[PDB]
Amino acid sequence: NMVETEPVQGCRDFPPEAMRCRRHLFDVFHATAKTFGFEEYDAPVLESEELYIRKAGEEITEQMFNFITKGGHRVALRPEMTPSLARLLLGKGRSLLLPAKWYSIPQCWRYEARREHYQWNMDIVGVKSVSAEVELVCAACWAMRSLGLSSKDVGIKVNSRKVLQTVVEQAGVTSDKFAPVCVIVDKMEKIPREEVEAQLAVLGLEPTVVDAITTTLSLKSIDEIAQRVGEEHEAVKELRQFFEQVEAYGYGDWVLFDASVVRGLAYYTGIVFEGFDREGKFRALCGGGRYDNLLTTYGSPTPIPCAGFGFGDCVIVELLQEKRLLPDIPHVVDDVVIPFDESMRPHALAVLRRLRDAGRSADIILDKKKVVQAFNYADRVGAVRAVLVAPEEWERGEVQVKMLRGFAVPLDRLV
Amino acid sequence: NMVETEPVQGCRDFPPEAMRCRRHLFDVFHATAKTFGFEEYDAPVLESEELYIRKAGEEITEQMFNFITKGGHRVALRPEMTPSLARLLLGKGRSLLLPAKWYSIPQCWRYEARREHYQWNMDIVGVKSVSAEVELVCAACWAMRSLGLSSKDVGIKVNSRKVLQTVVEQAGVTSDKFAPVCVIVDKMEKIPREEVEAQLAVLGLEPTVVDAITTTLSLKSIDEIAQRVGEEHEAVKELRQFFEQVEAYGYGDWVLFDASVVRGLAYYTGIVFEGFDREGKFRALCGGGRYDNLLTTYGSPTPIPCAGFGFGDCVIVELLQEKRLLPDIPHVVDDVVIPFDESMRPHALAVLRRLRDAGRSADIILDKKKVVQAFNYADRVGAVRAVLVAPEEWERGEVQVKMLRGFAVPLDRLV
Ligand SMILES: N[C@@H](Cc1c[nH]c[nH+]1)C(=O)O
Ligand SMILES: N[C@@H](Cc1c[nH]c[nH+]1)C(=O)O
Secondary structure, eight states: OOOOOSOSTTOOOBOHHHHHHHHHHHHHHHHHHHHTTOEEOBOOSEEEGGGGOOOSOOHHHHTOEEEEOSSSOEEEEOSOSHHHHHHHHHHSOTTOOSSEEEEEOOEEEOOOOOOEEEEEEEEEESOOSTHHHHHHHHHHHHHHHHTTOOTTTEEEEEEEHHHHHHHHHHTTOOGGGHHHHHHHHTTTTTSOHHHHHHHHHHTTOOHHHHHHHHHHHTOOSHHHHHHHHOTTOHHHHHHHHHHHHHHHHTOGGGEEEOTTOOOSOTTOOSEEEEEEETTSOSSOSEEEEEOSSHHHHTTOSSOOOEEEEEEESSHHHHHHHHTTOOOOOOOOEEEEEEESSGGGHHHHHHHHHHHHHTTOOEEEOOSOOOHHHHHHHHHHTTEEEEEEEOHHHHHTTEEEEEEOOOEEEEGGGGO | OOOOOSOSTTOOOBOHHHHHHHHHHHHHHHHHHHHTTOEEOBOOSEEEGGGGOOOSOOHHHHTOEEEEOSSSOEEEEOSOSHHHHHHHHHHSOTTOOSSEEEEEOOEEEOOOOOOEEEEEEEEEESOOSTHHHHHHHHHHHHHHHHTTOOTTTEEEEEEEHHHHHHHHHHTTOOGGGHHHHHHHHTTTTTSOHHHHHHHHHHTTOOHHHHHHHHHHHTOOSHHHHHHHHOTTOHHHHHHHHHHHHHHHHTOGGGEEEOTTOOOSOTTOOSEEEEEEETTSOSSOSEEEEEOSSHHHHTTOSSOOOEEEEEEESSHHHHHHHHTTOOOOOOOOEEEEEEESSGGGHHHHHHHHHHHHHTTOOEEEOOSOOOHHHHHHHHHHTTEEEEEEEOHHHHHTTEEEEEEOOOEEEEGGGGO
């Protein structure tokens, strides 16, 4: 029998073909981070399970890929990066210089009865003002633009949880139900409205409060939220500022207000946002927001404002494929060095060294094969040039070069 | 209280400082792979535990970080990449084109009562001749050279298991004890010779056979192995060819013969090799060899020759640090855009866009701060240029640029 060739249940293999696609995407994530002044970090995929106990009914924490070690504790393959980021920030001492702009491209994990995805994370730490969210949304737009998408293809929808926070506060509800409410109300587009209301009732919320919540989610303009919660309410000022700053940067066509956007995570406190395709065909492309309390929650002596997003590797690829923006780009190499026969191998190796020393990418024919088969290989591997190392030419201090009709060239002029 | 800021027991955090070091190393691994014509792949860190059942007493398999899922099976965080590579190769159909040269930089895991390391893997598939091992050893040398090491610092020791294979065969021992013998004999430098002999006796090996094994490991020349097993023995021809090919490529000073090198993995069948520091201060820098039977073992209908190495991220870094070849390279960015005050923020954002559109890396001051504090930040983040966006200049279609005494420059001439 054969060994099992399929990977573990919910997990992806990346042979070279699929890896090029992933690298194409990751190259954009690194390049955009660099363009925006963000610094790379990483942490272990294995974290203490205690890091993810939030008690808000979040899908992210419910679907934890956890297990017990033995000697150690209860651990989990990380379902997200943000708790790890906060751990690193706190573990950094007073030596953490603010503002800090950190990014990573972690694999994250889930379990249900797709268990693995990569997620670009970008976070700005120590910045109170909406300029953090502006920069983050602009980075997400820049990355999509770098991938060949335009504002005709995609948008980013923006809201502030401070609106719903006030509506909930003024209705007489305890603030400890706010996060679970956000979590439930996040389900609006996914489940029937009566079911959202049913779940809010199970939380103990009165029908008039539920209606207030319902209503605010469906207001189509910022001017309309200004009517409900006050024109100088801090969400109104912050959203106006957010839009005017994104407009000034030149991404006005990419962004829009949507009162129904809350996101599914407990810890967002301010502006929240979600990337979407304008044909309404795919799930969220990316999502994030401000989370000013999380570090306090983790034991920071002083509050540290934060905002950030995650941008998954799966939805974006489906969208780019639909838009024909991910053609296969076959493997290439600059040179294939071809020994005329095995006696020429030592000389061909010196030639291969010379080429690589000059910054070229180059293969040599490894097993014994005829020149015609060697040219076949050169075509297969996508060589720009074949360098044939034959006895006559070698005597003259030359090799034969064919751009892929073969011409003798002095060794020195190869590079 | 604070959340636990330390990572899970045997695992490393990579905040930006430490991440730069890792990126410096990984950049070399990618660059060397590219130079040598290797193609990147990846697979899930989670694999079926069945993939690693070899029954040879290997340290690698004994120290498995395994667990049971629930719905799924018995799984492990991969202790090595080679089984995953073989799975991918087999899962690729007749559509696998040979020879193939594939590389990856996986995190690998172990458990003992350091649990995590990254390991550059390079493997050549479908090549019978020693030219595979030549190319692989040259790649390891090229990577170390790229990191600033020379043949004065490091070497690669080379042997062939075919020598010990014959000695074991001629002594009348069953071939199913060969791998476990290799595994035990790998321990020679680590444990007393009598203990190696003790372990070989526990395997059921007779004292005269043990002595034959002992003796062959201590022969200092290939000419001496030629005396024992025959001058045209295939290990002798292959080692001679290996050395002459590495010499021709120009790395003769990096490589040497050592009859004691066997490596600790069950599946090596031919040439094996190990990178080492010439001061005798560190553990193996890298290690690999030919493994012609593994794919057959996994159910390949036809034999597929393979050779490859792993190159860890931990020993090399300790060595480079000792040699002062890993200085911190602080973060830099091309431009910091400084609004003169908050009213200038929209204009500063248009300027930031312009700079980034031109391929520059640039920050803007995010929170409100005084110009003097903004210059402090610019120094902190390692900006090459501060771009001050002030009212007077803006009116003239200009900004102020300071190389890090401030001069007015037309917007267009910024880039
Ligand atoms: N951790 C969030 C994304 C995020 C990063 N920073 C803030 N939010 C998620 O997984 O959706
Ligand atoms: N898997 C080996 C290295 C290797 C890669 N290819 C062949 N050997 C190890 O972990 O040491």
